[PDB]
A paper describes a structure:
DHFR is an enzyme vital for cellular replication, mainly due to its important role in the one-carbon metabolism pathway. DHFR reduces dihydrofolate (DHF) to tetrahydrofolate (THF). Nicotinamide adenine dinucleotide phosphate (NADPH) is required for this catalytic reaction. The mutation F98Y in Staphylococcus aureus dihydrofolate reductase (SaDHFR) confers resistance to the clinically important antifolate trimethoprim (TMP).
At that time, the NADPH in R-27 complex was thought to be in its α configuration (α-NADPH). Further refinement of the SaDHFR:R-27 structure was needed to assess the fit of t-NADPH into the NADPH binding site. Upon refinement of these two structures in phenix, we observed that the t-NADPH cofactor better satisfied both the local electron density map and difference density that arose in the α-NADPH structure. Additionally, we observe a decrease in the average cofactor B-factors (from 39.98 with α-NADPH to 33.55 with t-NADPH) and the B-factors of the oxygen atom involved in cyclization (from 39.22 with α-NADPH to 34.15 with t-NADPH). Furthermore, there is an overall decrease in Rfree for the structure with the remediation of the NADPH cofactor, with a decrease from 0.2543 with α-NADPH to 0.2529 with t-NADPH, a meaningful decrease given the minor structural differences between cofactor structures. Computing difference density based on the original assignment of α-NADPH revealed an unsatisfied region of density at the site of ring-closure, which is satisfied by reassignment of t-NADPH. Thus, we created two new, improved structure models with significant implications in terms of biological physical chemistry (discussed herein). Both new structures were deposited in the PDB.
Author numbering: 1 to 157
The structure:
């Protein structure tokens, strides 16, 4: 199973100056439940922006740097190596790798942030004519989650 896993705002912003533009604890928990025990694949810049591999799952970084090495991180140098990864594989970021993978994945787990943030990194355009809405769940607002958001699982028609 090959999935995209992304949070993006109303204009598909996913990042600003190496940071997430929003603070949404419920989405981090969403990320944890989906991807714990499985595989996250990310381009080099997305990994560096995070700074450490995420615990309790395989962390795979795509880069052309043959000296890249980080404890707890498996390195690949080719898009085609993604297809040899066993198990459930989530494409995690960033804009470049999403552009390379959006036409290849089976499904996408999107968190739509119902806001307009300043961004410099974007998720590719996509149309619902190509994706069936398997589920759409509104996140709950509270104390620490103050931006409306929606969990979409989209599956390729
Ligand atoms: N929500 C998110 O995902 C967030 C992520 N970002 C990041 O995304 C922003 C935009 O950068 P980006 O390019 O989208 O990030 P990215 O896609 O995570 O990193 C791109 C890098 O991945 C490597 N790469 C990609 N395709 C490859 C291929 N076919 N073969 C070999 N290596 C390949 C290469 O690393 P190289 O070979 O150069 O070492 C390239 O420069 C950056 O400012 C980051 O901070 C921003 C903040 C939040
Ligand atoms: C969660 C946000 C998020 N949600 C969803 N549904 N999919 C995603 N692909 C990401 C994401 C992301 C990027 C890689 C990111 C950037 C970052 O820049 C600091 C910190 C984190 C991060 C810090 C702590 N724990 C998990 C992830 C993630």
């Amino acid at each position: 199973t090959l999935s995209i896993l992304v949070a993006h705002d109303l204009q598909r912003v996913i990042g600003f100056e190496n940071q997430l533009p929003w603070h949404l604890p419920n989405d981090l928990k969403h990320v944890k439940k989906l991807s714990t025990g499985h595989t996250l694949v990310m381009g080099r810049k997305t990994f560096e922006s995070i700074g450490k591999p995420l615990p309790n799952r395989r962390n795979v970084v795509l880069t052309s740097d043959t000296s890249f090495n980080v404890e707890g991180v498996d390195v690949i140098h080719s898009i085609e190596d993604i297809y040899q990864l066993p198990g459930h594989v989530f494409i995690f970021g960033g804009q470049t790798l999403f552009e390379e993978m959006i036409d290849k994945v089976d499904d996408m787990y999107i968190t739509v942030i119902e806001g307009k943030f300043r961004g410099d990194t974007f998720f590719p355009p996509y149309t619902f004519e190509d994706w069936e809405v398997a589920s759409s769940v509104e996140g709950k607002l509270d104390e620490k989650n103050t931006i409306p958001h929606t969990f979409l699982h989209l599956i390729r028609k």
